[PDB]
Amino acid sequence: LSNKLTLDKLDVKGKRVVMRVDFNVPMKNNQITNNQRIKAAVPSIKFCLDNGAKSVVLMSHLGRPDGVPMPDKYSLEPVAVELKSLLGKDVLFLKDCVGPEVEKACANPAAGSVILLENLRFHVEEEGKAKAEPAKIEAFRASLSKLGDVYVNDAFGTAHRAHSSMVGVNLPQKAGGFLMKKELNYFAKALESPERPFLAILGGAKVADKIQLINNMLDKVNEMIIGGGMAFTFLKVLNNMEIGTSLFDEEGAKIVKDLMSKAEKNGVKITLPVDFVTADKFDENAKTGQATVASGIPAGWMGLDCGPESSKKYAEAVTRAKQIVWNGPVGVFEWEAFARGTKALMDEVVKATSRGCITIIGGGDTATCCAKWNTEDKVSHVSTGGGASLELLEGKVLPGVDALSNI
Ligand SMILES: Nc1ncnc2c1ncn2[C@@H]1O[C@H](COP(=O)(O)OP(=O)(O)O)[C@@H](O)[C@H]1O
Ligand code: BEF
Ligand SMILES: [Cl-]
Ligand SMILES: [Mg+2]
């Protein structure tokens, strides 16, 4: 951000601040399971209020409601409650993020007002697909722009997304916040001359998105574990494995052999799982089973964790690493029946940190592993960015950063 306006140089006195944050927090039973991302924005928010901002209007997405209002499922209102306690100031929650009533609420607020808007992705114009029309995208952006006099982007977690709230706000001063700065600085340092072998661990559930990041990552790392939900696309293509109802990406399947070829060309050792804990449905209380790559996963069952032989291979890769970036649990760690693989890998990553490995864990869900097993201070860095971090690993400038004002 050397070339970009940042909040430390933004005059906020008497100014309404509209601030993009990543408040896409994990949820279970309608309760927030990790407030890490909310906590992480508090320094920028407090700084605005402390230096005389008239208001701070906070805006974020939650989940992927795909451009339709889903207040029953993906409302930010529970975040408003949680932010109140973390800030030490109350926060007014609005039931939309645009236009007439929202604009009036944000137009001329009482001094020191903190305002949290509803989920930006309840509008198709944020992403804007989920057919979004250009004229409406423009109007959405124009509405968001009215809500502050100056703009701050502290949404590191979302910085890889060229969405309306992230790149489309039209105000004279668009400043990076302190979390954006903290995260970018940490990665700049850690990615400059990584310790080697440099292992990437890619798991989780955002297969369509994250399979597309592997190609450029293969020029940067010396090993890659491909686990969690990601593995099944590779296994079906490479091994002709039956995967049942496990996560599968049709588009990504088409580049699996090219990715493996590139890994071979680049001397990147690829560790895929060889065994699984299976489930008869996507449920905490599913009946469970065991499968190997040889046995395949039965029709109508899904692999929701790796098994012990996979964990041993993962451990082997960790033991070789001098640096690790991990994004994506290697099973559905939120459910105890499917948490063992991720716990075992976490145990190994902590053991690695203790003998000098530089260990970076990132993501809304993956950081929640750290919170669950109390390892946030037992690894080198826990990032609020998952996909955002992997895009820095590829060597990319993030759109949310690129959109900021130059100095
Ligand atoms: N085999 C699997 N099948 C389905 N979901 C999985 C599997 N392994 C991991 N997951 C899920 O991946 C989710 C997180 O993935 P993702 O959103 O990509 O990570 P993050 O928030 O760290 O970037 C977790 O909620 C976990 O339940
Ligand atoms: F689900 Be994200 F990549 F933190
Ligand atoms: Cl995805
Ligand atoms: Mg996630």
Strand order of the largest sheet: 5-6-4-1-7-8
Question: Which CATH architecture of the largest domain would you pick?
Answer: 3-Layer(aba) Sandwich
CA distance, first residue to last residue: 9 Å
Strand-pairing-aware structural class: alpha/beta
The Rg value, from CA coordinates, equals 22 Å
CATH class term of the largest domain: Alpha Beta
| Helix run count | 18
- CATH homologous superfamily caption of the largest domain: Phosphoglycerate kinase, N-terminal domain
How much β-strand is present in the residues? Answer: 15-25%
Q: Which molecules are bound in this entry?
A: adenosine-5'-diphosphate, beryllium trifluoride ion, chloride ion, magnesium ion
Helix content: 25-40%
Overall number of domains = 2
User: What is CATH's topology name of the largest domain?
Assistant: Rossmann fold
Shape: globular
Largest sheet: 6 strands, parallel
Counting DSSP E segments of at least 2 residues, the number of strands comes to 17
Region (Mitochondrial targeting region exposed following cis-trans isomerization by PIN1 and recognized by the TOM complex for mitochondrial translocation of the protein): 36-41
Subcellular location: Cytoplasm, Cytosol; Mitochondrion matrix
Binding site for AMP: 205-206, 210, 229, 303, 334
Binding site for (2R)-3-phosphoglycerate: 21-24, 36-37, 60-61, 63-64, 120-121, 160-161
